[PDB]
Amino acid sequence: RKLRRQMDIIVSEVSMIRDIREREIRIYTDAGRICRPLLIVEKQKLLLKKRHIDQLKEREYNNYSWQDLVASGVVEYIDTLEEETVMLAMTPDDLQEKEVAYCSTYTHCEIHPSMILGVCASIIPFPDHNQSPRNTYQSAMGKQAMGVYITNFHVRMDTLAHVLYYPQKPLVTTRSMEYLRFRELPAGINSIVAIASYTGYNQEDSVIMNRSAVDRGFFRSVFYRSYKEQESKKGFDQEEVFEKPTRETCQGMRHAIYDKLDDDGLIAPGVRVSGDDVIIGKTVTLPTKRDCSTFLRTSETGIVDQVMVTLNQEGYKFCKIRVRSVRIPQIGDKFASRHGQKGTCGIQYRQEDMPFTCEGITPDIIINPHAIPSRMTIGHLIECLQGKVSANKGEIGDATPFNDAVNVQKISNLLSDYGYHLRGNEVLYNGFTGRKITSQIFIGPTYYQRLKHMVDDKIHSRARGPIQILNRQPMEGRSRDGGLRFGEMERDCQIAHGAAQFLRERLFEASDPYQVHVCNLCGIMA
């Protein structure tokens, strides 16, 4: 242990385990062992001293760093096997202080318990106040939350990219976000959320959004979609070339207008493109020249953002075209808090219809009260209260999970100091009538996220559309009109209903109707 802590003959990652009962000493040096740093405790005292803390405070312009701690032997790496034999102290101020002797042989002390969390779980404020599956759900949602995925997103040309116009760093933040760089690239906006049952359009995990706020850019985004097309001269006489074809030169073409394309067969930037529009005009020489041009998604309606032409790894000319489409929030768009509170925008009300406080503050978002009880996401309410206090005080709130310095009573007193109800409640006035609402609504700033799931990308319909070759059954063509699968469960449901005619309609007439001539004498047709 002395050698490892001095880094003389034993490297830091080497793990030494003494099974005293089994009279064994196992020393492990192979890769793949998961280990974490822990402060060393000797004689119920940390080896980490104020001198070390000051040298770290002056981390730069003095060359002092974490490696110096490791070399000094104040903090050492422990793997799971060695951690079996370690006597951890959760905190030095409490567990190894002279008190009721629960244990006086502590060997290490946790640097900070919150370091047990991951990247996505570290952005949850007050996660120790939420029911754990909601922490898991927020961990899942944070990966789908919009924001600025990378600073140099303009140069990049990804197949799909979502960029929020006005990302904001949370008013209530965890200290781990400083190292996640969530402040530099936020994913979400602070919204004045009021937990009320206003008109019933926020029921069942639904949300009512402020139409005026949406008009003011609230939760607006870009959707960049990149299409890559390569021209390949592979084949004896089968060559592909970028060019705007003609309705007569090619073997066959389409009613779609090709006027958008340029002389090189590529659509210029800044041109609005909707469905049934050609962005890349390609022609493949027939073994005339068949039209091999490419179209867009019918639902998609954006502007050609950037058109680049280059040679791929194969040396063939190819073009990447980035189309930009602006996504404003609308009914059906999904927003989620940082506590597993996921819901769709049920309806959008103007600032007039939205309820207002005595100060004229209307909630940007209204969520149903019933979302809170069953989920037991008390962290959401605490985040709302702390965000209110932070907005009034001008200081970003701290929501580090295991912090005894911050609690609901202290936050309530701080809020009381700013002329507000200590529990975050406000007297709200009905927007339609102006009458005071009998119950006092809980309203405050909460950090919400716009998930990538937009109703625009999910809406699709099929009505007498294209069919495939053999089955003669529906298949999506030039759109999202591939139809819906009438599965065995739906068949059984209609059987139970007894709607024989409707079941027959959905399974034959709608799928692949067909008639054949058959001989009565011998059943085989001819």
Partner: protein, 192 residues
């Protein structure tokens, strides 16, 4: 339609105030939890001194576990009842639970007084380490804190170990949800 429009006048919200409890209620809950800790300690002392006589049809370990579990369950139930009685008529948690719209008495108790014992496969937190639930406890520690009794309410905040134990408990619920989603569909398809 009618009750939704009357709700525009009446109003409904939920908040921190509905989660707070009277200081007297907090004192009563803390006293109950402390008494439960002392009772579990007494049971552990009897087991250590071999003064615990196993009940018929159960081993010594099963008898000790049953006694500890009943003690902790009684503590949880009593604390929840105390919190529910402390709740006022204006309490929104009480309004929703009484109306049956959402939530339950157990949810109110967990939010206000005590989350309660955490169980994996129907048993207290197992000794994943060598005779330890976590490296922060002494070996052969059968106390409520060691074996995963969350004495703090969601409002108060769970301590660092209790959060991990609660995550362990909820992982079982997530697994059950996935299993049910992938399982319950085909029994009907077999019967049909």
């Amino acid at each position: 339609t009618v009750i939704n429009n009357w709700l525009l006048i009446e109003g409904h919200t939920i908040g921190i105030g509905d989660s707070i409890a009277d200081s007297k209620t907090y004192q009563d809950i803390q006293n109950t939890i402390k008494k439960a800790k002392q009772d579990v300690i007494e049971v552990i002392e009897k087991a250590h001194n071999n003064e615990l006589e196993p009940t018929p049809g159960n081993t010594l370990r099963q008898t000790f576990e049953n006694q500890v579990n009943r003690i902790l369950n009684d503590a949880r139930d009593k604390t929840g009842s105390s919190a529910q009685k402390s709740l006022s008529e204006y309490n929104n948690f009480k309004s929703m639970v009484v109306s049956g719209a959402k939530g339950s008495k157990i949810n109110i108790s967990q939010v206000i007084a005590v989350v309660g014992q955490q169980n994996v496969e129907g048993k207290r937190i197992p000794f994943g380490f060598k005779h330890r639930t976590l490296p922060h406890f002494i070996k052969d520690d059968y106390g409520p804190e060691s074996r995963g009794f969350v004495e703090n309410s969601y409002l108060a905040g769970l301590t660092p170990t209790e959060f991990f134990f609660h995550a362990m408990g909820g992982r079982e619920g997530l697994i059950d949800t996935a299993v049910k989603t992938a399982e319950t569909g085909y029994i009907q398809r077999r019967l049909i």
